Scaffold this active site. Structure first.
Site, PDB file in Angstrom:
ATOM      1  N   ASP A  76     -33.408 -83.337 -24.957  1.00  9.99           N
ATOM      2  CA  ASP A  76     -32.866 -82.206 -25.638  1.00  9.99           C
ATOM      3  C   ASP A  76     -32.451 -82.530 -27.071  1.00  9.99           C
ATOM      4  O   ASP A  76     -31.779 -83.541 -27.306  1.00  9.99           O
ATOM      5  CB  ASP A  76     -31.705 -81.669 -24.851  1.00  9.99           C
ATOM      6  N   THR A 131     -32.681 -74.292 -26.361  1.00 10.28           N
ATOM      7  CA  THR A 131     -33.131 -75.109 -25.236  1.00 10.28           C
ATOM      8  C   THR A 131     -33.933 -74.325 -24.209  1.00 10.28           C
ATOM      9  O   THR A 131     -35.067 -74.695 -23.872  1.00 10.28           O
ATOM     10  CB  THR A 131     -31.902 -75.821 -24.577  1.00 10.28           C
ATOM     11  N   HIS A 166     -24.597 -82.085 -31.620  1.00  5.44           N
ATOM     12  CA  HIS A 166     -23.613 -81.031 -31.764  1.00  5.44           C
ATOM     13  C   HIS A 166     -22.252 -81.561 -32.218  1.00  5.44           C
ATOM     14  O   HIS A 166     -21.583 -80.927 -33.030  1.00  5.44           O
ATOM     15  CB  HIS A 166     -23.412 -80.294 -30.461  1.00  5.44           C
ATOM     16  N   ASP A 180     -37.378 -80.341 -27.377  1.00  6.26           N
ATOM     17  CA  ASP A 180     -37.405 -78.893 -27.340  1.00  6.26           C
ATOM     18  C   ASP A 180     -37.068 -78.235 -28.678  1.00  6.26           C
ATOM     19  O   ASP A 180     -37.491 -77.123 -28.923  1.00  6.26           O
ATOM     20  CB  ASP A 180     -36.502 -78.360 -26.236  1.00  6.26           C
ATOM     21  N   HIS A 215     -28.514 -75.628 -33.830  1.00  9.19           N
ATOM     22  CA  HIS A 215     -29.951 -75.376 -34.012  1.00  9.19           C
ATOM     23  C   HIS A 215     -30.190 -74.014 -33.424  1.00  9.19           C
ATOM     24  O   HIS A 215     -29.291 -73.423 -32.857  1.00  9.19           O
ATOM     25  CB  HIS A 215     -30.753 -76.383 -33.221  1.00  9.19           C
ATOM     26  N   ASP A 225     -50.134 -52.575 -35.714  1.00  5.39           N
ATOM     27  CA  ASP A 225     -49.396 -53.050 -34.559  1.00  5.39           C
ATOM     28  C   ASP A 225     -48.102 -52.279 -34.370  1.00  5.39           C
ATOM     29  O   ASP A 225     -46.993 -52.805 -34.475  1.00  5.39           O
ATOM     30  CB  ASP A 225     -49.128 -54.562 -34.625  1.00  5.39           C
ATOM     31  N   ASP A 241     -46.776 -50.931 -31.633  1.00  6.73           N
ATOM     32  CA  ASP A 241     -46.004 -51.320 -30.436  1.00  6.73           C
ATOM     33  C   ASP A 241     -45.538 -52.792 -30.481  1.00  6.73           C
ATOM     34  O   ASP A 241     -45.044 -53.338 -29.503  1.00  6.73           O
ATOM     35  CB  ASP A 241     -46.803 -51.057 -29.148  1.00  6.73           C
ATOM     36  N   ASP A 281     -46.768 -55.739 -30.247  1.00 10.02           N
ATOM     37  CA  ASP A 281     -47.148 -56.646 -29.174  1.00 10.02           C
ATOM     38  C   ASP A 281     -47.985 -57.818 -29.666  1.00 10.02           C
ATOM     39  O   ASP A 281     -48.410 -58.687 -28.879  1.00 10.02           O
ATOM     40  CB  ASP A 281     -47.828 -55.886 -27.993  1.00 10.02           C
ATOM     41  N   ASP A 337     -54.085 -52.613 -32.253  1.00  6.87           N
ATOM     42  CA  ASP A 337     -53.734 -51.347 -31.581  1.00  6.87           C
ATOM     43  C   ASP A 337     -55.021 -50.573 -31.331  1.00  6.87           C
ATOM     44  O   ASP A 337     -55.910 -50.566 -32.168  1.00  6.87           O
ATOM     45  CB  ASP A 337     -52.900 -50.435 -32.479  1.00  6.87           C
TER      46      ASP A 337
HETATM   47  C1  LIG Z   1     -49.628 -64.268 -24.992  1.00 13.24           C
HETATM   48  O1  LIG Z   1     -50.344 -64.536 -23.800  1.00 13.24           O
HETATM   49  C2  LIG Z   1     -50.117 -63.535 -22.776  1.00 13.24           C
HETATM   50  C3  LIG Z   1     -50.820 -63.935 -21.472  1.00 13.24           C
HETATM   51  O2  LIG Z   1     -52.224 -64.089 -21.702  1.00 13.24           O
HETATM   52  C4  LIG Z   1     -50.547 -62.148 -23.272  1.00 13.24           C
HETATM   53  O3  LIG Z   1     -49.939 -61.179 -22.409  1.00 13.24           O
HETATM   54  C5  LIG Z   1     -50.935 -60.562 -21.605  1.00 13.24           C
HETATM   55  O4  LIG Z   1     -51.477 -59.561 -22.380  1.00 13.24           O
HETATM   56  C6  LIG Z   1     -52.455 -58.782 -21.728  1.00 13.24           C
HETATM   57  C7  LIG Z   1     -52.900 -57.682 -22.691  1.00 13.24           C
HETATM   58  O5  LIG Z   1     -51.864 -56.736 -22.891  1.00 13.24           O
HETATM   59  C8  LIG Z   1     -51.927 -58.139 -20.441  1.00 13.24           C
HETATM   60  O6  LIG Z   1     -53.100 -57.664 -19.801  1.00 13.24           O
HETATM   61  C9  LIG Z   1     -52.839 -56.621 -18.852  1.00 13.24           C
HETATM   62  O7  LIG Z   1     -52.683 -57.191 -17.552  1.00 13.24           O
HETATM   63  C10 LIG Z   1     -52.421 -56.258 -16.492  1.00 13.24           C
HETATM   64  C11 LIG Z   1     -52.294 -57.030 -15.172  1.00 13.24           C
HETATM   65  O8  LIG Z   1     -51.025 -57.713 -15.075  1.00 13.24           O
HETATM   66  C12 LIG Z   1     -53.534 -55.194 -16.450  1.00 13.24           C
HETATM   67  O9  LIG Z   1     -53.190 -54.181 -15.498  1.00 13.24           O
HETATM   68  C13 LIG Z   1     -53.758 -54.558 -17.835  1.00 13.24           C
HETATM   69  O10 LIG Z   1     -54.855 -53.626 -17.831  1.00 13.24           O
HETATM   70  C14 LIG Z   1     -54.017 -55.656 -18.858  1.00 13.24           C
HETATM   71  O11 LIG Z   1     -55.206 -56.358 -18.490  1.00 13.24           O
HETATM   72  C15 LIG Z   1     -51.206 -59.153 -19.560  1.00 13.24           C
HETATM   73  O12 LIG Z   1     -50.523 -58.515 -18.500  1.00 13.24           O
HETATM   74  C16 LIG Z   1     -50.227 -60.003 -20.375  1.00 13.24           C
HETATM   75  N1  LIG Z   1     -49.765 -61.158 -19.602  1.00 13.24           N
HETATM   76  C17 LIG Z   1     -48.525 -61.670 -19.777  1.00 13.24           C
HETATM   77  C18 LIG Z   1     -48.071 -62.862 -18.989  1.00 13.24           C
HETATM   78  O13 LIG Z   1     -47.730 -61.203 -20.578  1.00 13.24           O
HETATM   79  C19 LIG Z   1     -50.045 -61.864 -24.661  1.00 13.24           C
HETATM   80  O14 LIG Z   1     -50.658 -60.735 -25.212  1.00 13.24           O
HETATM   81  C20 LIG Z   1     -50.302 -63.082 -25.606  1.00 13.24           C
HETATM   82  N2  LIG Z   1     -49.741 -62.723 -26.864  1.00 13.24           N
HETATM   83  C21 LIG Z   1     -50.368 -62.793 -28.045  1.00 13.24           C
HETATM   84  C22 LIG Z   1     -49.625 -62.325 -29.249  1.00 13.24           C
HETATM   85  O15 LIG Z   1     -51.511 -63.219 -28.144  1.00 13.24           O
HETATM   86  N1  LIG Z   2     -32.975 -80.529 -15.861  1.00  6.17           N
HETATM   87  C1  LIG Z   2     -32.688 -79.757 -16.676  1.00  6.17           C
HETATM   88  C2  LIG Z   2     -32.348 -78.965 -17.589  1.00  6.17           C
HETATM   89  C3  LIG Z   2     -33.166 -78.543 -18.586  1.00  6.17           C
HETATM   90  C4  LIG Z   2     -34.554 -79.062 -18.847  1.00  6.17           C
HETATM   91  C5  LIG Z   2     -35.419 -79.629 -17.905  1.00  6.17           C
HETATM   92  N2  LIG Z   2     -36.551 -80.025 -18.561  1.00  6.17           N
HETATM   93  C6  LIG Z   2     -37.699 -80.676 -17.937  1.00  6.17           C
HETATM   94  C7  LIG Z   2     -38.951 -79.840 -18.147  1.00  6.17           C
HETATM   95  C8  LIG Z   2     -40.136 -80.477 -18.514  1.00  6.17           C
HETATM   96  C9  LIG Z   2     -41.310 -79.751 -18.701  1.00  6.17           C
HETATM   97  C10 LIG Z   2     -41.295 -78.360 -18.528  1.00  6.17           C
HETATM   98  F1  LIG Z   2     -42.425 -77.648 -18.706  1.00  6.17           F
HETATM   99  C11 LIG Z   2     -40.108 -77.721 -18.162  1.00  6.17           C
HETATM  100  C12 LIG Z   2     -38.943 -78.455 -17.969  1.00  6.17           C
HETATM  101  C13 LIG Z   2     -36.496 -79.743 -19.891  1.00  6.17           C
HETATM  102  C14 LIG Z   2     -37.375 -79.932 -20.964  1.00  6.17           C
HETATM  103  C15 LIG Z   2     -37.031 -79.503 -22.245  1.00  6.17           C
HETATM  104 CL1  LIG Z   2     -38.188 -79.819 -23.574  1.00  6.17          CL
HETATM  105  C16 LIG Z   2     -35.797 -78.892 -22.503  1.00  6.17           C
HETATM  106  C17 LIG Z   2     -34.879 -78.659 -21.472  1.00  6.17           C
HETATM  107  C18 LIG Z   2     -35.205 -79.084 -20.183  1.00  6.17           C
HETATM  108  C19 LIG Z   2     -30.964 -78.399 -17.423  1.00  6.17           C
HETATM  109  C20 LIG Z   2     -30.582 -78.189 -16.086  1.00  6.17           C
HETATM  110  C21 LIG Z   2     -29.354 -77.631 -15.762  1.00  6.17           C
HETATM  111  C22 LIG Z   2     -28.489 -77.271 -16.787  1.00  6.17           C
HETATM  112  C23 LIG Z   2     -27.172 -76.679 -16.393  1.00  6.17           C
HETATM  113  O1  LIG Z   2     -26.394 -76.297 -17.250  1.00  6.17           O
HETATM  114  O2  LIG Z   2     -26.861 -76.551 -15.103  1.00  6.17           O
HETATM  115  C24 LIG Z   2     -28.857 -77.460 -18.137  1.00  6.17           C
HETATM  116  C25 LIG Z   2     -30.106 -78.015 -18.461  1.00  6.17           C
HETATM  117 CA   LIG Z   3     -50.447 -53.594 -30.768  1.00  4.81          CA
HETATM  118 ZN   LIG Z   4     -32.235 -78.057 -26.371  1.00  2.00          ZN
END
Ligand SMILES: *[C@@H]1O[C@H](CO)[C@@H](O[C@@H]2O[C@H](CO)[C@@H](O[C@@H]3O[C@H](CO)[C@@H](O)[C@H](O)[C@@H]3O)[C@H](O)[C@H]2NC(C)=O)[C@H](O)[C@H]1NC(C)=O
Ligand SMILES: N#C/C(=C\c1cn(Cc2ccc(F)cc2)c2cc(Cl)ccc12)c1ccc(C(=O)O)cc1
Ligand SMILES: [Ca+2]
Ligand SMILES: [Zn+2]
Ligand code: NA
Ligand code: NA
Length: 754
Positions: free
Chosen positions: A109, A147, A253, A296, A401, A634, A636, A638, A642
């Site tokens: 961390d 974090t 910190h 992180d 941070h 854009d 919405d 997202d 669009d």
């Molecule tokens: C960041 O990556 C995520 C994941 O690939 C992107 O979010 C995804 O965006 C697509 C397009 O809006 C969503 O697709 C939709 O999925 C549902 C099924 O859950 C379907 O019914 C719709 O017709 C459409 O295919 C998808 O749900 C969504 N997934 C997640 C986890 O959010 C996102 O757009 C990416 N962001 C950027 C800025 O590239």
């Molecule tokens: N263990 C823990 C904790 C946090 C994290 C655990 N992992 C490992 C990891 C590695 C890869 C990955 F995909 C995801 C996660 C971390 C990795 C990063 Cl970079 C940053 C933070 C954390 C934590 C648990 C409890 C508490 C509390 O207050 O009770 C506070 C902190």
């Molecule tokens: Ca859009």
């Molecule tokens: Zn942190």
């Protein structure tokens, strides 16, 4: 119950049982043993096993997997791993029964990137990992640089807006509950979106160790537990593990980052890293396991005296809730308060004092590179806080941070060491959103859909199971000739200007390609303007209300001047700028109705300065530039192009849609001794996504000459090519002399200006 023989098994006896407050009576007795510390000494070697000990130096310890990590060093004349020479791992060397190289993610961390400079004197183990394996100068976290958003981004490959962990604290209006670092709320799965690595592994038959550890468990115990799990038989043994330490964040910190009193926390971390590599070595796993050392976020100098208070800007501070600190998020404290006015609150927070150490934004107006808007948990009102400062509502630590993720102090670290990482290899900085794909590759997993660009980090790895492919064009262009007559209208090249191939349009529409002496464009007959415009300004080039119809395009699919005359607030600008015409004959092409785009007068100040002043400057600094410019829609927020039904604004009375943003991608030769149009090798790109706003309230100096504020605005709104691709459904750099992975790296680059 009891934990005898169950300590840290996969009443509870697991490494999170404290957190859920639910361990056995003797969990503490049996599992958190400290007796005699963590180090074997000569006098302990071959001891009779003593169950009260924290770890063991008995002959049976290796089999149980519970030796102190220095057992073989002290008791068998072996070397510490760090004292051994770097030697290349050309293939994984794993014990009998291993079927893939395991992955260990060692997470720290608040480990700021610059801390690496302290070097092999302070951090010998870490420095060897860094020197010997694959590393980058830094790794960019996601915003907010806190974090929880960053750990879950690492786990998922998603922006916080997508994975749902938008902050260490958040309010969900649908749940009508708040999430906090302290509390049981955070354990409820409803908060956590996407698909984290541990679930991706499980769903695909790859066993995952635990990624989280109760605060109670000492670091040395976390390492010992991972090492013991690695001695389990084939069908029980996880392939992926994570260690975590609250250091050096906790000390940052208290003492701030630049302190000499940071040397000791950093050596305590290096000690734990050494325990891990010694431990792996004695289990014969030090040339089997892939190890990722990653942070992180970084850490900045922040003190109690450098606090802005909203009470000094707002007269109604008691009617609002503020998420404070190194960022701000503001919402109405009360539900049905008709005295709550967010327009007034924003105006009250805008450019009020000369040194003001924060800036208010509606979330849709935040730089698009932050990707911080498309979630109901993100309040409409946001404050981007100046580095070194806090913001609080009303009126013991030297560090914090959370700031904008392009700030240097917020950068953190990456090192990959092991069989599947490259040997003694430096790679350019990259963003932590990209790691989930890599971790998937390291484990033979198909990644769930995410915001990494899969292939962009292939250069980190010795071998790559995943080969990226360019997307297929979804609509082919047209190349109109003169199909119409001037009287028709009721208004009121490649070699030079298209250096990397035509952008591919990845959605269903109809568009025409248009050639001119000075520029090429892809005109959309749906949106009545170009999707892109491409031109090349040579280093040695010169700068020096006609709108005329375009013969190649039906009046049906052309804009008109009458609409701008009638729209009181909307003017128009050009994607290729008249000021850059090669000749007065050529210049008439720049006044075609097909080169025209809708622009607020306030924005024209920005856009005219960019086009008339900055493009020349860039061409002069970089030995020519190629520019591709265009509109973004854009509404919405997202981050995605669009569809027509999402467009909420048109030039008055017309079907001409108003863009939310204008982009440019500016490319030259990395080898600046070569001109942009005669470049043999790697490219250099910088890009922006400017918000198309009807005022310049964002720029507190905007009453001054444009040379005092425009470029600062543009730097704040720097973007990756990849960001623009998402926003336009275009694909760029399709015809270059470079490999497609190299181009993916280039499309993920962000020019930061730090
Ligand atoms: C960041 O990556 C995520 C994941 O690939 C992107 O979010 C995804 O965006 C697509 C397009 O809006 C969503 O697709 C939709 O999925 C549902 C099924 O859950 C379907 O019914 C719709 O017709 C459409 O295919 C998808 O749900 C969504 N997934 C997640 C986890 O959010 C996102 O757009 C990416 N962001 C950027 C800025 O590239
Ligand atoms: N263990 C823990 C904790 C946090 C994290 C655990 N992992 C490992 C990891 C590695 C890869 C990955 F995909 C995801 C996660 C971390 C990795 C990063 Cl970079 C940053 C933070 C954390 C934590 C648990 C409890 C508490 C509390 O207050 O009770 C506070 C902190
Ligand atoms: Ca859009
Ligand atoms: Zn942190
Ligand atoms: Na007008
Ligand atoms: Na202003």
């Amino acid at each position: 119950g009891s934990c005898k023989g169950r300590c840290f098994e996969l009443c509870r006896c697991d490494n999170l049982c404290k957190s859920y407050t639910s361990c056995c009576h003797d969990f503490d007795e049996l599992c958190l043993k400290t007796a005699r510390g963590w180090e074997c000494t000569k006098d302990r070697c071959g001891e009779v096993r003593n169950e009260e000990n924290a770890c063991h130096c008995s002959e049976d310890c290796l089999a149980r997997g519970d030796c102190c990590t220095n057992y073989q060093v002290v008791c068998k004349g072996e070397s510490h791993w760090v004292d051994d020479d770097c030697e290349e791992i050309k293939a994984a060397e794993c014990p009998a029964g291993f079927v893939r190289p395991p992955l260990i993610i060692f997470s720290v961390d608040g480990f700021r990137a610059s801390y690496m400079k302290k070097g092999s004197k302070v951090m010998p183990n870490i420095e060897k990992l860094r020197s010997c394996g694959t590393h980058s100068p830094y790794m960019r976290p996601v915003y907010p640089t806190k974090t929880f958003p960053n750990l879950y981004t690492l786990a998922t490959g998603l922006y916080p807006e997508s994975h749902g962990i938008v902050g260490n604290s958040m309010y969900d209006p649908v749940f009508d509950a708040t999430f906090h670092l302290r509390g049981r709320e955070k354990f409820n799965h409803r908060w956590w979106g996407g698909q984290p690595l541990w679930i991706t592994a499980t769903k695909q038959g790859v066993k995952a160790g635990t990624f989280f550890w109760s605060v109670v468990i000492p670091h040395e115990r976390r390492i010992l537990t991972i090492l013991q799990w690695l001695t389990l038989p084939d069908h029980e043994r996880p392939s992926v593990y994570a260690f975590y330490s609250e250091q050096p964040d906790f000390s940052g910190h208290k003492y701030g980052p630049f302190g000499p009193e940071m040397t000791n926390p950093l050596r305590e971390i290096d000690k734990i890293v050494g325990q891990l590599m010694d431990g792996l070595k004695q289990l014969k796993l030090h040339r089997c396991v892939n190890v990722i050392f990653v942070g992180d976020h970084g850490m900045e100098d922040v003190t109690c005296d450098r606090t802005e208070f909203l009470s000094n800007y707002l007269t109604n501070v008691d009617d609002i809730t503020l998420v404070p600190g190194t960022l701000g998020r503001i919402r109405s404290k009360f539900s049905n308060n008709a005295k709550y006015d967010p327009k007034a609150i924003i105006a009250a927070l805008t450019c009020k004092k000369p040194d003001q150490h924060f800036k208010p934004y509606l979330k849709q107006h935040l730089p698009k590179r932050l990707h911080y808007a498309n979630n109901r948990r993100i309040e409409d009102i946001h404050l981007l806080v100046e580095r070194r400062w806090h913001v609080a509502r009303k009126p013991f630590f030297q560090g914090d941070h959370g700031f904008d993720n392009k700030v240097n102090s917020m950068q953190t670290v990456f090192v990959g060491y092991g069989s599947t990482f490259k040997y003694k290899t430096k790679v350019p900085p990259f963003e932590n959103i990209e790691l989930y794909n890599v971790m998937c590759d390291l484990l033979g997993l198909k990644p769930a859909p995410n915001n990494g660009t899969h292939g962009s980090l292939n250069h980190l790895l010795r071998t790559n199971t995943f080969r990226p492919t360019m997307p297929e064009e979804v609509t082919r262009p047209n190349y109109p000739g003169i199909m119409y007559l001037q009287s028709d209208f009721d208004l009121g090249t490649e070699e030079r200007h298209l250096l990397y191939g035509r952008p591919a349009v990845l959605y269903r529409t109809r568009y025409d390609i248009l050639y001119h002496t000075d520029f090429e464009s892809g005109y959309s007959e749906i949106f009545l303007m170009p999707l892109w415009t491409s031109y090349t300004v040579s280093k040695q080039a010169e700068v020096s209300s006609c709108v005329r119809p375009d013969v190649r395009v039906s009046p049906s699919f052309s804009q008109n001047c009458l609409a701008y005359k009638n729209d009181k607030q909307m003017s128009y600008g050009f994607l290729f700028p008249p000021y850059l015409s090669s000749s007065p004959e050529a210049k008439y092409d720049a006044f075609l109705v097909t080169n025209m785009v809708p622009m607020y007068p306030a924005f024209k100040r920005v856009w005219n300065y960019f086009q008339r002043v900055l493009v020349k400057k860039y061409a002069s600094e970089r030995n020519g530039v190629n520019v591709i410019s265009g509109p973004i829609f854009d509404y919405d927020y997202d981050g995605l192009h669009d569809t027509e039904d999402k467009i909420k604004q048109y030039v008055e009375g017309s079907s001409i849609p108003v863009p939310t943003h204008y982009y440019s991608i500016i490319t030259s030769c990395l080898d600046f001794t070569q001109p942009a149009d005669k470049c043999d090798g790697p490219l250099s790109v910088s890009s922006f996504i400017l918000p198309h706003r009807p005022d310049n309230e964002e720029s507190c100096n905007s009453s001054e000459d444009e040379s005092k504020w425009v470029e600062e605005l543009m730097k704040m709104h720097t973007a990756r090519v990849r960001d623009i691709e998402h926003l336009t459904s275009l694909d760029f750099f399709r015809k270059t002399s470079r490999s497609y992975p190299e181009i993916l790296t280039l499309k993920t680059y962000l020019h930061t200006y730090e």
